[PDB]
Amino acid sequence: STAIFSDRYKGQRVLGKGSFGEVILCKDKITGQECAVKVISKRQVKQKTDKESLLREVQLLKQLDHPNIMKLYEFFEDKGYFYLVGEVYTGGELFDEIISRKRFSEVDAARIIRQVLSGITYMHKNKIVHRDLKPENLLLESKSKDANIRIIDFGLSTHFEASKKMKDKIGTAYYIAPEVLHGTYDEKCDVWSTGVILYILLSGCPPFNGANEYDILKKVEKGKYTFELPQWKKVSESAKDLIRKMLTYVPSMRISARDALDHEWIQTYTKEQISVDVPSLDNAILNIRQFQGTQKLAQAALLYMGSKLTSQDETKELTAIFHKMDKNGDGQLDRAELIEGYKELMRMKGQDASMLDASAVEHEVDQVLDAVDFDKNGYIEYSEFVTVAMDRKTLLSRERLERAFRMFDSDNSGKISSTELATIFGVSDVDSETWKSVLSEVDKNNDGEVDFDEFQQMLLKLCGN
Numbered sequence: 486s487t488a489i490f491s492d493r494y495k496g497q498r499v500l501g502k503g504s505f506g507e508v509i510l511c512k513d514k515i516t517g518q519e520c521a522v523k524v525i526s527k528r529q530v531k532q533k534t535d536k537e538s539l540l541r542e543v544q545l546l547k548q549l550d551h552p553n554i555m556k557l558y559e560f561f562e563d564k565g566y567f568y569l570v571g572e573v574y575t576g577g578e579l580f581d582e583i584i585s586r587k588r589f590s591e592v593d594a595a596r597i598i599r600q601v602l603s604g605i606t607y608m609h610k611n612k613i614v615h616r617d618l619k620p621e622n623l624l625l626e627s628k629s630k631d632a633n634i635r636i637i638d639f640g641l642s643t644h645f646e647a648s649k650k651m652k653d654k655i656g657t658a659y660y661i662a663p664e665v666l667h668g669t670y671d672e673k674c675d676v677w678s679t680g681v682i683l684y685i686l687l688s689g690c691p692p693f694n695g696a697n698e699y700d701i702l703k704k705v706e707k708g709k710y711t712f713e714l715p716q717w718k719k720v721s722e723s724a725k726d727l728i729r730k731m732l733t734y735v736p737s738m739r740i741s742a743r744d745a746l747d748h749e750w751i752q753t754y755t756k757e758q759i760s761v762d763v764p765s766l767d768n769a770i771l772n773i774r775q776f777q778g779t780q781k782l783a784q785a786a787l788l789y790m791g792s793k794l795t796s797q798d799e800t801k802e803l804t805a806i807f808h809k810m811d812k813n814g815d816g817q818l819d820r821a822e823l824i825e826g827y828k829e830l831m832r833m834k835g836q837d838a839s840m841l842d843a844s845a846v847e848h849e850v851d852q853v854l855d856a857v858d859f860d861k862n863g864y865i866e867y868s869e870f871v872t873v874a875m876d877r878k879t880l881l882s883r884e885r886l887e888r889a890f891r892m893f894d895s896d897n898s899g900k901i902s903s904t905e906l907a908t909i910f911g912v913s914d915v916d917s918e919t920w921k922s923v924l925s926e927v928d929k930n931n932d933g934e935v936d937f938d939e940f941q942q943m944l945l946k947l948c949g950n
């Protein structure tokens with residue numbers, strides 16, 4: 486009597502994309518309980534462990550409870566997917582919220598890091614290491630101002646091989662502990678990462694930085710950072726001392742999460758009354774707004790490139806599936822076949838995680854047919870169904886590209902400088918000669934700035950079109 490995910494949950498909408506897979510907002514078909522389901526495709530992510538080991542982990546994680554740790558409820562596995570069912574949080578990533586404040590101080594930073602250390606300490610007590618700890622993994626419980634922080638993805642790194650695809654590792658290099666690179670690591674790597682996050686919260690820049698991923702890893706691996714920037718003048722010795730102890734090279738000498746919790750800086754700046762000297766850190770908030778925008782734009786760039794490539798793969802495949810089922814040779818089909826075909830795209834592709842059952846397909850087809858000026862129930866021309874169907878998929882990633890572009894263009898200039906692109910393509914790890922070569926060909930008269938149409942053409946060229 487084996488339990489199947491879609492007998493129990495129905496997908497409502499897509500919340501976003503995390504490490505290892507898609508996150509879908511799901512709903513229990515009997516109780517109406519809402520849940521965020523991480524869908525990990527077995528074809529894209531290799532396991533590092535055996536079946537036994539992972540189930541034992543899942544059982545343990547379901548029994549753990551802490552106010553700063555995402556709550557896991559259920560776990561399903563079928564032939565091509567793992568489904569991790571957790572509590573849904575609606576407050577978004579930490580940094581996205583933080584850029585929307587107009588004021589931020591050492592009291593606010595300290596309240597954040599106390600939360601984080603407190604979830605970590607708890608998990609280390611139960612011998613669970615995060616390993617991939619970074620700002621994207623800190624969500625706020627709700628859209629409330631006073632919202633708690635929940636750490637997501639504890640436990641996954643020990644059982645799943647991380648993606649090599651750069652679309653999946655944007656922004657990991659800044660946070661990873663030297664010893665994780667060399668392969669002998671323990672729980673202290675989580676303190677390093679938190680130490681980095683605190684450095685960024687107090688200055689707005691990463692302690693280890695570089696023009697591309699491998700440059701960033703080389704700094705980290707050397708382990709040298711400095712407090713020499715102007716904005717460190719605004720910050721207590723005490724906080725710098727904690728940072729130093731968290732960013733200590735040799736893990737055996739690095740402070741534990743639990744001893745970090747008792748550190749003077751945390752004690753002083755997390756007492757709710759005393760604000761003995763609490764300047765706003767506007768430079769920090771300004772640098773963080775820039776650093777965040779850069780990342781989210783590179784991220785959306787690569788997901789747009791990926792979506793375009795996925796699209797070409799799926800358009801040609803869907804066309805061939807239909808061309809085959811069309812025994813007539815005319816180009817005409819009906820609703821129930823379009824559905825059988827779309828489904829068979831899914832059986833082969835298995836890329837779309839909001840199509841978690843036969844009923845998700847039915848409704849997608851109806852959304853397509855209701856879009857085209859076509860009776861959803863006479864005989865339809867497959868050619869035009871394929872066009873509308875695929876674009877509808879490129880919507881999410883094309884509209885988000887435009888939006889991450891607008892959000893990056895903070896002065897509403899309409900354009901990004903050649904210097905800004907350099908930073909954008911550095912972070913997306915697209916070779917410099919290669920993007921200059923593409924720019925040169927889009928606008929052959931340009932003067933080191935591109936508008937949105939131009940930028941988008943560059944991306945289409947960088948994925949072979």
Ligand SMILES: CCOc1ccc2cc(-c3nn(C(C)(C)C)c(N)c3C(N)=O)cnc2c1
Pocket residue numbers: 500501502503508521522523546555557569570571572573574575577578624637638639640641
């Ligand atoms: C053992 C790990 O299990 C899970 C299960 C569900 C998860 C849901 C999330 C989640 N991601 N998001 C995005 C911001 C990426 C859209 C949420 N809104 C999540 C949530 N918990 O509401 C993250 N990690 C998960 C990890």
